[PDB]
Amino acid sequence: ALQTIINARLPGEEGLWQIHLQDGKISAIDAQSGVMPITENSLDAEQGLVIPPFVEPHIHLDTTQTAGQPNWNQSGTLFEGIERWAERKALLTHDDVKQRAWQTLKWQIANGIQHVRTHVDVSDATLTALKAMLEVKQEVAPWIDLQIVAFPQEGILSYPNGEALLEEALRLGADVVGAIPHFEFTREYGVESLHKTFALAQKYDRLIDVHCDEIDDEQSRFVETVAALAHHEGMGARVTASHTTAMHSYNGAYTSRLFRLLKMSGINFVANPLVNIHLQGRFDTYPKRRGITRVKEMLESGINVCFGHDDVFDPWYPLGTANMLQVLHMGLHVCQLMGYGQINDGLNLITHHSARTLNLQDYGIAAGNSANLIILPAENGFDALRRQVPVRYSVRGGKVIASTQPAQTTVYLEQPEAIDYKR
Amino acid sequence: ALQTIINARLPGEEGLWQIHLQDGKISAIDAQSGVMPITENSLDAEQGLVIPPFVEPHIHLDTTQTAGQPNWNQSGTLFEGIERWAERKALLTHDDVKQRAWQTLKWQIANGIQHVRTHVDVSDATLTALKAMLEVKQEVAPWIDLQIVAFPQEGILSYPNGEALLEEALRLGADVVGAIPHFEFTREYGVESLHKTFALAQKYDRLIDVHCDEIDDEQSRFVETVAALAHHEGMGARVTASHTTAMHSYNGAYTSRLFRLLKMSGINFVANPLVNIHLQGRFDTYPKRRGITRVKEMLESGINVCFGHDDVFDPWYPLGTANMLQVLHMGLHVCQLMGYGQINDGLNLITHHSARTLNLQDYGIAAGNSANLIILPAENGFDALRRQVPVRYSVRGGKVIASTQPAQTTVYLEQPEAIDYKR
Numbered sequence: 066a067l068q069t070i071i072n073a074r075l076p077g078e079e080g081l082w083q084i085h086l087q088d089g090k091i092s093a094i095d096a097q098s099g100v101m102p103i104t105e106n107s108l109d110a111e112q113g114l115v116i117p118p119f120v121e122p123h124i125h126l127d128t129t130q131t132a133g134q135p136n137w138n139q140s141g142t143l144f145e146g147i148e149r150w151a152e153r154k155a156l157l158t159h160d161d162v163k164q165r166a167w168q169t170l171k172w173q174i175a176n177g178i179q180h181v182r183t184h185v186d187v188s189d190a191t192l193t194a195l196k197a198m199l200e201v202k203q204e205v206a207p208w209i210d211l212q213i214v215a216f217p218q219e220g221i222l223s224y225p226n227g228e229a230l231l232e233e234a235l236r237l238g239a240d241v242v243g244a245i246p247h248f249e250f251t252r253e254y255g256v257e258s259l260h261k262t263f264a265l266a267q268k269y270d271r272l273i274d275v276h277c278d279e280i281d282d283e284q285s286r287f288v289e290t291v292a293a294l295a296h297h298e299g300m301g302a303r304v305t306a307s308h309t310t311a312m313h314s315y316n317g318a319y320t321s322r323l324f325r326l327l328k329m330s331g332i333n334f335v336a337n338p339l340v341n342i343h344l345q346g347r348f349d350t351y352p353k354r355r356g357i358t359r360v361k362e363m364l365e366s367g368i369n370v371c372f373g374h375d376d377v378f379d380p381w382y383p384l385g386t387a388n389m390l391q392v393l394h395m396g397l398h399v400c401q402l403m404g405y406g407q408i409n410d411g412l413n414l415i416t417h418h419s420a421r422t423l424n425l426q427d428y429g430i431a432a433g434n435s436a437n438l439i440i441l442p443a444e445n446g447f448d449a450l451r452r453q454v455p456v457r458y459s460v461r462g463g464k465v466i467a468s469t470q471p472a473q474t475t476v477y478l479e480q481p482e483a484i485d486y487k488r
Numbered sequence: 489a490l491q492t493i494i495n496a497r498l499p500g501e502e503g504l505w506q507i508h509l510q511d512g513k514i515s516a517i518d519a520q521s522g523v524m525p526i527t528e529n530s531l532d533a534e535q536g537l538v539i540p541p542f543v544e545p546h547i548h549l550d551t552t553q554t555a556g557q558p559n560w561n562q563s564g565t566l567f568e569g570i571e572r573w574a575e576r577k578a579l580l581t582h583d584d585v586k587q588r589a590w591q592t593l594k595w596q597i598a599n600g601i602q603h604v605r606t607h608v609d610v611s612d613a614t615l616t617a618l619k620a621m622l623e624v625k626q627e628v629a630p631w632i633d634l635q636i637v638a639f640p641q642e643g644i645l646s647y648p649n650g651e652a653l654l655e656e657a658l659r660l661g662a663d664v665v666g667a668i669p670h671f672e673f674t675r676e677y678g679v680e681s682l683h684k685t686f687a688l689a690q691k692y693d694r695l696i697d698v699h700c701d702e703i704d705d706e707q708s709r710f711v712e713t714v715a716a717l718a719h720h721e722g723m724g725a726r727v728t729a730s731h732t733t734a735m736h737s738y739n740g741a742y743t744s745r746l747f748r749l750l751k752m753s754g755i756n757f758v759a760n761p762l763v764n765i766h767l768q769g770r771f772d773t774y775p776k777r778r779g780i781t782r783v784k785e786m787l788e789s790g791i792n793v794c795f796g797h798d799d800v801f802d803p804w805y806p807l808g809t810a811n812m813l814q815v816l817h818m819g820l821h822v823c824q825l826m827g828y829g830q831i832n833d834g835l836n837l838i839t840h841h842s843a844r845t846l847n848l849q850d851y852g853i854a855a856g857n858s859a860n861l862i863i864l865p866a867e868n869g870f871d872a873l874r875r876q877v878p879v880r881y882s883v884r885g886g887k888v889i890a891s892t893q894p895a896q897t898t899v900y901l902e903q904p905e906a907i908d909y910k911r
């Protein structure tokens with residue numbers, strides 16, 4: 066029965082704020098001139114930062130939690146990962162997918178993530194993972210709004226009945242149409258697959274999220290077709306180009322020309338730091354490229370870009386706890402967004418920009434919006450990122466759905482001293 | 489009055505182990521065939537991992553904790569960092585250096601680090617930071633063995649009285665002789681500075697740790713002189729080449745030839761992931777090189793390499809909590825040591841290999857050694873790294889000097905559920 070969040074700091078705002086709640090929504094937001102006393106029905110942010118929930122714009126819940134089953138990827142390569150996944154085929158069932166997806170979703174709830182977009186491989190005639198994920202979506206709805214992308218992993222034109230299966234996935238309820246041009250047999254199939262993807266999105270009124278140019282090939286430019294088609298249909302807001310790691314290898318002249326179109330099209334971009342730094346640059350000896358898309362330049366140009374985890378504890382990425390501040394930390398380093406303001410503003414890459422990517426209509430600490438917000442025990446984005454703080458409280462519909470009692474560290478010098486890693 | 493560590497897991501060993509303690513030393517280590525009961529004077533590792541303390545082989549305690557004073561580095565560049573540091577000159581006093589060094593040292597104690605090698609800028613006629621650090625070394629001795637490197641930041645031959653000041657630092661007690669060849673005015677001064685560095689190390693019987701080829705210049709090959717001189721003097725074990733980021737840009741043929749000498753010389757290498765990924769590759773547009781030395785290849789060749797944090801909360805690196813598992817996480821990603829075994833064995837890069845780099849004589853969980861060890865609430869190195877676990881207990885001389893009560897996370901679904909991020 067929470068009525069107020071008090072003593073809240075807000076990004077880009079001075080001072081402390083009080084967030085009033087009513088009927089599961091934010092009724093008003095008022096500045097405070099000092100610290101407010103706690104009381105029944107008040108959740109004290111304790112001068113910590115309050116932001117609208119973290120978002121996971123790109124993850125594969127159908128493959129999550131499978132690392133080491135039955136064997137571990139020892140080389141760490143994409144190739145071996147594919148083989149290790151194949152060895153687990155006998156365990157891939159409806160219940161298995163639901164159990165693993167739920168395990169990661171619980172970690173996400175614990176990490177203040179209330180919006181998740183999962184890709185699901187639909188290059189499977191039985192659509193086993195998709196059927197399982199559609200049930201998971203309904204089951205987790207009280208805690209996470211889950212979007213499902215029908216992802217034609219083996220291609221649309223390069224896989225038997227690929228287009229038919231992609232459309233079947235949409236008819237079953239998938240929220241987003243996926244594609245993977247650079248994986249199609251030819252450049253022509255790649256371009257044609259995008260026309261088919263856009264046609265399906267318009268036919269069913271769905272969003273689009275393409276695994277776009279995820280390859281260190283300076284000639285992989287499917288992103289220009291994604292942006293051009295979006296501009297032509299006037300649907301930029303509903304379109305996302307995931308990865309675009311090839312952009313890391315483009316010459317500057319083409320990239321400059323392309324950026325005009327990217328801005329005009331209004332499409333969204335997702336970079337996946339943890340996985341990109343790991344899987345890109347694998348064909349280089351030395352020097353080795355970083356392989357993340359042009360995040361810094363997109364921000365400078367006002368192009369919406371955000372960060373996803375992509376994989377959690379699977380053959381393609383053995384690590385992760387589904388933590389967005391960890392994803393952000395990696396991205397700030399690899400993209401060299403290390404100035405104070407760049408780091409502080411970093412939270413945008415895992416909150417607001419990701420909400421835009423998911424085309425969310427009810428997101429942000431604003432009057433009238435649902436009371437969905439989280440509290441970080443930190444002074445600002447810089448502090449939260451530097452100390453990799455947990456989510457103190459996650460509030461959804463005005464109710465607490467997760468909480469973390471912080472770790473307590475003590476050093477025993479001449480006298481015991483508490484250490485909080487602040488100066 | 490601890491007499492035993494029980495239920496301990498050890499890297500590379502099967503099962504649980506009991507570590508007996510007597511007179512501040514490890515008296516014996518015995519395998520257990522099951523879980524042992526707790527009791528008075530027994531520290532229960534609770535099937536967590538027990539390892540010899542984390543080590544910080546490369547940090548600058550003279551510059552730590554100064555970020556944002558008086559202004560923040562907004563571009564994040566090395567150039568601006570130098571300017572921001574210059575603006576703080578009026579605050580650089582004896583007491584200031586001691587206060588800041590101690591602040592970071594407390595974070596290190598909290599993070600299970602009992603061995604630290606700090607570089608101290610001795611291109612200052614007043615040697616202010618060095619005098620302060622020598623007192624800090626004595627003060628922190630009960631918790632951390634601190635090694636001080638006399639670091640001629642502005643060069644030995646390229647700075648007024650550079651050589652005289654370097655020797656004065658040694659006469660005052662600095663443990664290690666530093667150098668920075670690539671920063672000298674000419675290649676010839678660079679090579680000559682190394683001869684002078686080795687001569688001083690032999691004259692005073694000190695270790696050597698060179699800021700070596702920290703630059704994206706494929707022609708910066710001072711590392712071959714460091715290794716050759718060490719081989720000639722038969723002192724490889726006492727010598728360290730820090731950074732060697734230029735090696736990331738060498739052609740493969742030269743690198744292969746060089747590796748024979750690196751192995752034969754027996755010198756140590758320190759990579760500083762967090763700072764290297766941030767400061768290297770700054771002159772590239774796109775693609776952008778990673779800029780970390782050849783860590784993977786050194787491991788494959790049996791060349792001792794380890795990881796340092798380098799900078800903590802300063803103009804050259806605004807982040808950090810002086811956490812070695814965080815440094816390791818970055819290094820595993822950038823160096824693409826992402827296979828299961830590579831990640832699991834990762835702890836070696838922040839424990840044993842770093843101890844070798846510091847030429848430590850009393851390190852490791854072995855009978856006869858001082859009872860210096862830490863307990864991680866994780867099953868193995870992979871688990872500790874993936875979950876970025878805190879140090880549950882840090883034991884020194886058989887006594888607890890630090891402890892962390894873990895954070896407690898709960899998600900409120902149909903029923904409350906504890907989340908520990910394990911599957």
Ligand SMILES: [Fe+3]
Pocket residue numbers: 123124125184276375
């Ligand atoms: Fe993906």
Ligand SMILES: [Fe+3]
Pocket residue numbers: 546547548607699798
């Ligand atoms: Fe350094």
